[PDB]
């Protein structure tokens, strides 16, 4: 049941992808650690909540 993943490597030694192994000991999801393998989304719903899609090169008001 071992879950193997990739570490986004910062400062590399004078020493190919590096990995880290994770295994869940408990039956309850809540007991589990944070994956940190999270997703980004486009701000649109907040920065441009307007009915009629807007084109930056053209006049906002027309």
């Amino acid at each position: 049941g071992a879950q193997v993943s990739s570490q986004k490597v910062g400062a590399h030694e004078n020493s190919s992808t590096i990995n880290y192994t994770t295994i869940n000991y408990y039956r309850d999801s809540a007991s589990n650690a944070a994956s940190k393998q999270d997703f980004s989304q486009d701000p649109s719903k907040f920065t441009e909540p307007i009915k009629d899609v807007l084109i930056k090169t053209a006049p906002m008001l027309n």
Binding site: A2, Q3, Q37, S40, K56, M60
Partner: protein, 288 residues
């Protein structure tokens, strides 16, 4: 066996593209904030830019990353006196919440609704109170979780401490700080950082005092309480202990963003108090 492993929180931000001069009918710089929208502009739209390969990431600013830190929500005080003392053996009863302290509360409050598995870590420290010289054997604490409806303890040693059904943590002094995980236990589809209403409806036909209730307050007893005590029997020499509770929100999700708390917190609600309403400092319009 082994299981190995679209835009990721830790993916490199968009590269800056080479941009030359412009003499056109296209007006990116010009707009109208009145519409409710924010101009999606980028350096290359208003100035001549060079080509730049972007390596920077928003990894650390993600919802989980932003809260992925153990925060102190309360300090519980208990004790174990000499059998003789006239005053009662002091056992602690704390109503679970993130509002007794300000730091974590302000962060969670950047948003209206939230959802998450809760990780509680307990740091226990003890000490001697009297210019005495007698000693005391290693103490064993009992942290009992009493959910709304269950018999709340009235004595450091009454029947309730049996915890037949309630979850109890038996911590041993000097050992690695106690820790337990708790699922999303809300009676709603998500925790409400804010409730613009009441738990009761004042009915005309019915006496004023009866239909009355607190503003912004839902379940009189959201999540029950934490009842802590020192299991050890009364000791000739009195020893006072303190239980620091660290709360960390994991596997977390948040909805509907809000402007951060600008002025000193005043109670469990949004209420502000006189003399604290002037946050910003003096600085002239034309001074760098």
């Amino acid at each position: 066996g082994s299981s190995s492993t679209a835009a990721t929180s830790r993916d490199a931000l968009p590269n800056t593209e080479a941009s030359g001069p412009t003499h056109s009918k296209e007006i990116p710089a010009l707009t109208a904030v009145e519409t409710g929208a924010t101009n999606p502009l980028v350096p290359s739209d208003t100035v001549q830019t060079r080509h730049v390969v972007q390596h920077r990431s928003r990894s650390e600013s993600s919802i989980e990353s932003f809260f992925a830190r153990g925060a102190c929500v309360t300090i519980m005080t208990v004790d174990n006196p000499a059998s003789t003392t006239n005053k009662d053996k002091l056992f602690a009863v704390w109503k679970i919440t993130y509002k007794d302290t300000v730091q974590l509360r302000r962060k969670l409050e950047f948003f209206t609704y939230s959802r998450f598995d809760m990780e509680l870590t307990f740091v226990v420290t003890a000490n001697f109170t009297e210019t005495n010289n007698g000693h005391a054997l290693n103490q064993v604490y009992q942290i009992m979780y009493v959910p709304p409806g269950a018999p709340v303890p009235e004595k450091w040693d009454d029947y309730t401490w049996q915890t037949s059904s309630n979850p109890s943590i038996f911590y041993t002094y000097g050992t690695a700080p106690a820790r337990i995980s708790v699922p999303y236990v809300g009676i709603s589809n998500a925790y409400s950082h804010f409730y613009d209403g009441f738990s009761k409806v004042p009915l005309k036909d019915q006496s004023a005092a009866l239909g009355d209730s607190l503003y912004g307050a839902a379940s009189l007893n959201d999540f029950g309480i934490l009842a802590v005590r020192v299991v050890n029997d009364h000791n000739p020499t009195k020893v006072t202990s303190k239980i620091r509770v660290y709360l960390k929100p994991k596997h977390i999700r948040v909805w509907c963003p809000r402007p951060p708390r600008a002025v000193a917190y005043y109670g469990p609600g949004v209420d502000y108090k006189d003399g604290t309403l002037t946050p910003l400092s003096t600085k002239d319009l034309t001074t760098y």
